[PDB]
């Protein structure tokens, strides 16, 4: 960020992670280019699934990790997460409190 708390960007590609508990499953990262800057930064998706949900080429919102940078656990080098794809606030789609738009 430019010192800010949030920023809006566009997904260009979707990467792959993996886990150890309770089994090995993909834990998902992406590459998101900043709209205001053009910088493409890695971002993590904290949830189960939601690789199904987000997309390529969608305009997303970004937030921090609450550790002043500083990648959380065994995720090497990601400093940001997505809270709102298309401004739809991921947790609403997480239960079924919202339905994804046309794109």
């Amino acid at each position: 960020f430019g010192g800010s708390s949030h920023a809006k960007g566009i997904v260009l590609e979707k990467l792959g992670i993996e886990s150890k508990q309770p089994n090995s499953a993909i834990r998902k990262c992406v590459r998101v280019q900043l709209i205001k800057n053009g910088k493409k930064v890695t971002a993590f998706v904290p949830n189960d699934g939601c690789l199904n949900f987000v997309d390529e080429n969608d305009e997303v919102l970004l937030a921090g990790f609450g550790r002043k940078g500083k990648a959380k656990g065994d995720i090497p080098g990601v400093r940001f997460k997505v809270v709102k794809v298309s401004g739809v606030s991921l947790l609403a789609l997480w239960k079924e409190k919202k339905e994804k738009p046309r794109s």
């Binding site: 993909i26 199904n52 949900f53 997309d55 079924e96 339905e99 738009p101 046309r102 794109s103």
Partner: protein
């Protein structure tokens, strides 16, 4: 960005603004419609012959549209194409679980400028508690759904409805606030039908029979990209099928001429203009002597260094002549290559909101692909190891699958709409939603992993030296399959050592651990049998 950009410039007053008044059929929508044209035409027209062209100024022309909730296909069809959805409500909807599913249809087709209008609340409520109910329904929609929406509250003043400031507030919101662009609708040329005429090539014995199609001449105005760009092109008519245009019409020494006049040889084009096979890549040159002598000097390259339409058809055939009616509105679609072609396609899916059933492979589905809708058997599969290893016959709450099926083939991977049909006497809407997502990817000639289980129970086990009481009955099968690698439900490897002349399930076979009596010796990788075609 550019596909919305091409739409704004040529469109002006003769392309109208799309107005779709969509709600329940039980309400008096017609009073609000004729009230709306009482605002448009001076004060005195209250008759419905829609759809029809109403001329109102040079700013915007406005054609008004209607459809009941009893028609099933146009409930889909008007949703993807409307610039304006006008929802009228009664004071008793909100947890009516069978007649409000169209909201999710407009969600999946994409939300235009949409409206909530409450008028029968006056007919239903008469106390101060309706002010809380209005805000509560506002907490339901659209303010829950989309930020920046307005809820319109109007009077029940049935026939005899106002010309006053309230219709200027509605038409204020319609005229001032404009739409938002859609991705793939603007990627296609699409035309709504306005005037429908039929010519029969005057009377002959060939003009009627069991199979005779006549000359349907249709008229209207264009939207989206310009449709005249190529004659004889393909087209889709919704509810009837795919066709091609008979004739397209629209009512709103030059070497470049010499190229595409095919009655003239190219040597005559060059010869009249100035003064063979591209399989040889090396271009033509002159002789070594002439090019050497001419290129003795290098001076010659020294600077080289530092809208209304009249559309003709010979369709439809005879059976839809009996399907003539006052026109329930039909828009024309557009077919494209790499979308007109067929293929096995894989789609990504999730489950409908307020949906209460499981979704099986064996129950066919209606599928809205753009301007198309196909009943198709939805075969599901899943991965668990970044590759296919299993398949599922139905859709639980546990996970949500990916669909693979032979349908039409579409490379650009459009968004997905899977609707399950109900009759017009079951719930209240024309369809009930099954699953929605995006077309995931394109994949033809693919084969599904269908694995099964062979049952063998162990009772007294050593690592390399073991017998099963009951897993088989033939020593010949085990003798053919002794080179294979047998497994166990916890993951213990093994192979068949030998059938050992016992067609009874007892046979020597090795494992890398002694098999647990709570475990079962199994076998996987089984027959992948064919796709359902429909």
């Amino acid at each position: 960005l550019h596909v919305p950009m091409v739409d704004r410039t040529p469109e002006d007053d003769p392309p109208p603004f799309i107005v779709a008044v969509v709600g329940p059929p039980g309400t008096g929508k017609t009073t609000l419609i004729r009230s709306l044209v009482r605002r448009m035409t001076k004060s005195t027209l209250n008759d419905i012959q829609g759809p029809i062209t109403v001329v109102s100024g040079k700013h915007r022309r406005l054609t008004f549209l209607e459809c009941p909730a009893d028609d099933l296909n146009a409930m889909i069809d008007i949703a993807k194409i409307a610039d304006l959805v006008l929802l009228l409500i009664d004071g008793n909807f909100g947890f009516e679980m069978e007649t409000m599913e169209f909201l999710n249809i407009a969600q999946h087709h994409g939300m235009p400028r949409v409206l909530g209008v409450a008028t029968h609340l006056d007919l239903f409520k008469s106390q101060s508690t309706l002010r809380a109910s209005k805000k509560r329904l506002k907490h339901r929609f659209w303010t829950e759904v989309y930020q920046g929406a307005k809820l319109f509250y109007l009077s029940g003043v049935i026939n005899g409805r106002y010309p006053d400031r309230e219709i200027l507030n509605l038409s204020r919101f319609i005229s001032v606030m404009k739409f938002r662009p859609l991705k793939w609708r603007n990627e296609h040329p699409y035309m709504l039908a306005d005037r429908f005429t039929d010519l029969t090539h005057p009377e002959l014995i060939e003009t009627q029979g069991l199979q005779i199609d006549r000359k349907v001449a249709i008229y209207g105005y264009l939207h989206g990209t310009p449709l005249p760009s190529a004659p004889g092109t393909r087209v889709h008519i919704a509810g009837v099928g795919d066709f091609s245009v008979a004739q397209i019409e629209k009512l709103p020494w030059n070497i470049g001429k010499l190229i595409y006049m095919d009655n003239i040889s190219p040597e005559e084009c060059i010869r009249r203009w100035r003064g063979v096979d591209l399989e040889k890549f090396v271009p033509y040159f002159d002789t070594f002597e002439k090019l050497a002598k001419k290129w003795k000097s290098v001076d010659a390259i020294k600077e080289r260094f530092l809208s209304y339409v009249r559309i003709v058809f010979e369709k439809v055939p005879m059976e839809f002549v009996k399907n003539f009616n006052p026109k329930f509105p039909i828009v024309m679609g557009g077919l494209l290559p790499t979308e007109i072609k067929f293929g096995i396609v894989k789609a990504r899916l999730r489950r409908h909101r307020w949906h209460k059933k499981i979704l099986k492979t064996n129950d066919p589905l209606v599928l809205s692909l753009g301007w198309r809708r196909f009943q198709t058997l939805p075969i599901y599969t899943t991965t668990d190891s970044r590759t296919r290893t299993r398949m599922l016959k139905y859709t639980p709450e546990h996970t949500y699958c990916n669909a693979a099926f032979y349908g039409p083939l579409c490379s650009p991977n459009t968004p997905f709409c899977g609707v399950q049909i109900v009759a017009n006497s079951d719930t209240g809407n024309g369809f009930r939603i099954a699953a929605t997502g995006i077309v995931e990817e394109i994949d033809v000639n693919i084969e599904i992993v269908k694995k099964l289980k062979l049952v063998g129970f162990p009772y007294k086990i050593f690592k390399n030296t073991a017998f099963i009481k009951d897993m088989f009955s033939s020593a010949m099968e085990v003798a053919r399959f002794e080179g294979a690698q047998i497994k166990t439900v916890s993951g213990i490897r093994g192979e068949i050592k030998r059938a050992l002349s016992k067609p009874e399930g007892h046979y020597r076979a090795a494992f890398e651990d002694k098999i647990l009596m709570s475990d079962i010796v199994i076998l996987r990788s089984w027959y992948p049998v064919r796709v359902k075609k429909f």
